[PDB]
Amino acid sequence: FDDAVEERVINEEYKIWKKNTPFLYDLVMTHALEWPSLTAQWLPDVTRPEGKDFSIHRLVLGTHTSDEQNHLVIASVQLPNDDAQFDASHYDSEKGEFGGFGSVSGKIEIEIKINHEGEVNRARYMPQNPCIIATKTPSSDVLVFDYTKHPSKPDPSGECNPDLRLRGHQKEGYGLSWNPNLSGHLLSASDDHTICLWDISAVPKGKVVDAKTIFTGHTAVVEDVSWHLLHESLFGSVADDQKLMIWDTRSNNTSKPSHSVDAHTAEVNCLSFNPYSEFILATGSADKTVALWDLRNLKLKLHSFESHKDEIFQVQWSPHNETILASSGTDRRLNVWDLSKIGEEQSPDAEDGPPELLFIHGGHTAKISDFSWNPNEPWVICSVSEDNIMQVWQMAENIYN
């Protein structure tokens, strides 16, 4: 009855959102996936076909089906060039400006499906070799696939043939981070209260690899883990114990972190290190806030970003803009924040949120599971929801510029 009453309100608000998209966006593409993806990550490569008004980008996706046909998925996405005529095809519209037919929108196509054992909790590519993808599986195993050592047609036998099997966990999780400074150093967060580290740099890629180190500082489900982008020894973890922990791999004590902070009034689901500001990171929580942190003084939260109406599961810094970050979760909203606007006055403009809230994306009518900033096209985001919708979108230049 409350899922029934919510559903009708959602539809009210979605109709109004579709109304306003030309005003709020420079790009909106919607694609219904065969199955919901729990995960999204842009691959770093773009190809710009010599003669065309679009470039080809790729996404790491996964499936979430309770049948036995789960796939790790690579999809292609055509996006307009910086040099290209702005028209109605940017809003999934083939209407000509002067009647008749205008232009086709960019295409979204499945390039590769690889048999996967259970749903794909999360999938991340290795920075030093984006052909290598790690996955979180319900089994508690982390799987590694080189997607170039597999057919693009999935094996009809239904067998999963991962290039490596990473042991060390007793339960599933979501958190997964590759060390961008030490090739093949992988962290994983688990419902078993532990963080596993593997070094696959030496191993020949179908054997089983045991965890090099297991970190036991948390007393509850570890939700997320992330390496520092500059300091090869430093990583953060967040957990259902409401703690942000900062770890140093040089320490011999794997039971106690370098720093432990009481970060939130509920579970901490996600963290992200600022790729331009080496002291700065953000955490997202079931307390419906994003917290801003300074590694130099973790006693004191710098800021609390408030506007979400439900649990936050993902937070990600803009790869292009040091003041820009985004968050998503169970309220079916993706908020874009500008920390440069903190403390500004506004024209009660002030009625509909704090000044550091740059943009609310209301495109999704189901819970958002994951999202990825396009690293090659500023302000493009891919977001995926539990209903199977994938959206590739870009707020209007006038909103940021």
Side-chain angles (χ1 to χ4, degrees), residues 1-2 4-5 8-11 13-14 17 20-47 49 51 53-81 84 86-94 96-106 108 111-112 114-148 150-152 154-158 160-204 206 208-255 257-298 300-340 342-344 346 348 350 352-396 398-400:
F1 181 68
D2 292 21
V5 163
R8 212 198 38 79
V9 173
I10 285 172
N11 281 313
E13 303 192 335
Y14 177 78
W17 176 76
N20 286 308
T21 52
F23 300 131
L24 293 178
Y25 298 81
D26 287 355
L27 179 78
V28 182
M29 311 168 71
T30 306
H31 176 101
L33 291 168
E34 167 166 32
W35 300 115
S37 185
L38 288 162
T39 185
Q41 186 181 32
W42 295 105
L43 288 164
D45 52 278
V46 44
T47 79
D53 64 340
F54 65 75
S55 287
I56 298 164
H57 302 248
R58 290 188 305 147
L59 285 156
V60 185
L61 300 173
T63 59
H64 186 189
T65 183
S66 64
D67 85 16
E68 285 308 324
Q69 303 184 323
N70 278 288
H71 301 109
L72 174 69
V73 169
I74 311 298
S76 69
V77 184
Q78 295 178 343
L79 295 179
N81 303 322
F86 180 75
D87 59 42
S89 74
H90 292 200
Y91 309 90
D92 275 349
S93 178
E94 294 194 340
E97 171 159 31
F98 297 103
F101 177 87
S103 54
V104 297
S105 298
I108 295 158
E111 308 298 274
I112 308 186
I114 303 174
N115 285 352
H116 192 266
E117 181 194 306
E119 59 264 38
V120 182
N121 283 357
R122 183 150 300 166
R124 295 294 181 258
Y125 76 83
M126 191 177 72
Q128 298 93 342
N129 182 4
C131 302
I132 311 303
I133 298 164
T135 73
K136 294 279 280 164
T137 77
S139 78
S140 86
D141 278 359
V142 169
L143 303 187
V144 182
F145 304 84
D146 182 338
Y147 70 72
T148 74
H150 290 76
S152 55
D155 186 349
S157 74
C160 182
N161 295 327
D163 301 300
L164 294 170
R165 216 141 192 149
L166 307 194
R167 274 296 140 60
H169 281 307
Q170 305 87 65
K171 293 192 192 309
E172 71 178 315
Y174 287 91
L176 196 63
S177 187
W178 293 105
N179 192 320
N181 289 304
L182 297 169
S183 193
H185 288 222
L186 183 66
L187 288 162
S188 151
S190 176
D191 288 14
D192 66 22
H193 306 183
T194 73
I195 296 152
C196 286
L197 170 68
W198 299 275
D199 172 5
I200 71 158
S201 59
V203 176
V208 171
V209 191
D210 282 283
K212 186 194 160 152
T213 319
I214 303 179
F215 306 83
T216 57
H218 289 291
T219 62
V221 163
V222 193
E223 296 281 0
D224 206 8
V225 69
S226 189
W227 292 104
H228 201 269
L229 310 157
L230 297 195
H231 305 321
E232 71 180 35
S233 294
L234 233 68
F235 77 81
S237 63
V238 291
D240 288 3
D241 64 9
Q242 311 185 184
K243 293 184 192 292
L244 166 63
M245 292 178 177
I246 305 304
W247 300 94
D248 192 318
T249 55
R250 297 168 297 175
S251 164
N252 286 106
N253 193 337
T254 66
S255 65
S258 305
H259 309 267
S260 183
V261 62
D262 308 328
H264 288 278
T265 53
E267 298 87 346
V268 189
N269 292 319
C270 55
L271 85 165
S272 179
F273 286 98
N274 185 314
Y276 290 109
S277 306
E278 74 175 83
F279 298 118
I280 306 303
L281 74 146
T283 60
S285 176
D287 74 8
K288 311 178 237 294
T289 75
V290 175
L292 189 62
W293 302 98
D294 186 333
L295 287 174
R296 304 171 284 192
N297 185 10
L298 287 167
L300 172 67
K301 178 178 307 190
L302 292 180
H303 188 76
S304 193
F305 299 98
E306 305 189 357
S307 263
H308 280 284
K309 289 161 198 216
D310 217 327
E311 175 160 27
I312 297 160
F313 280 106
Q314 189 57 279
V315 293
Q316 293 291 340
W317 287 99
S318 173
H320 298 104
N321 296 113
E322 64 283 352
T323 74
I324 304 303
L325 74 157
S327 50
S328 60
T330 298
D331 65 357
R332 314 177 305 283
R333 295 294 170 273
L334 194 160
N335 290 344
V336 188
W337 310 98
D338 186 349
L339 62 81
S340 72
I342 287 169
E344 287 200 330
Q346 14 164 213
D352 56 348
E356 66 268 25
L357 178 62
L358 184 63
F359 194 77
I360 307 175
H361 173 61
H364 294 267
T365 55
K367 301 171 182 202
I368 297 170
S369 310
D370 208 6
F371 74 89
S372 192
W373 292 99
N374 188 299
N376 290 303
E377 297 300 323
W379 296 100
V380 177
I381 291 170
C382 179
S383 37
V384 292
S385 38
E386 280 182 3
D387 62 350
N388 80 14
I389 296 297
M390 176 171 71
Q391 296 196 323
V392 177
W393 60 270
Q394 185 192 46
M395 72 182 72
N398 48 271
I399 294 183
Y400 58 85

